[PDB]
C-alpha cells in the first residue's frame, strides 16, 4: 500500500514462525521494541496486527 492508507491485517488463531522470518536474508532491518526477536518464539500473544 501507499503509506497515507497502509494495509493492516489481523493475525490470529494460528502458529507463527518468527524464527524463519528473523533468519530470512531478505531484511535490511528487523528492529524490535519492547520485545527481542529471539523471544517471540517462546512468548505469545492474544492477537498480532501486521
Amino acid at each position: 500500500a501507499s503509506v497515507y492508507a497502509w494495509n493492516r491485517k489481523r493475525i490470529s488463531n494460528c502458529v507463527a514462525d518468527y524464527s524463519v522470518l528473523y533468519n530470512s536474508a531478505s531484511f535490511s532491518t528487523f528492529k524490535c521494541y519492547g520485545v527481542s526477536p529471539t523471544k517471540l518464539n517462546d512468548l505469545c500473544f492474544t492477537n498480532v496486527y501486521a
Binding site: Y22, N23, S28, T38
Partner: protein, 47 residues
Amino acid sequence: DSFVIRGDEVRQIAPGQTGKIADYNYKLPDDFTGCVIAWNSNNLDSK
C-alpha cells in the same frame, strides 16, 4: 578470529545478537571484550 560473510550479516556479530550467522555458524560471548573490524571486499572476493 578471521572470516568472510555477506555484508548485511555483519549486523549479527555482536554480544546478544542472533540469526543464521550468530547462532548457526559463529557465536560471540555475551560479555565479549574486544573489537569487531569489517569491510567490503567485493573487488577481491566476488567473481
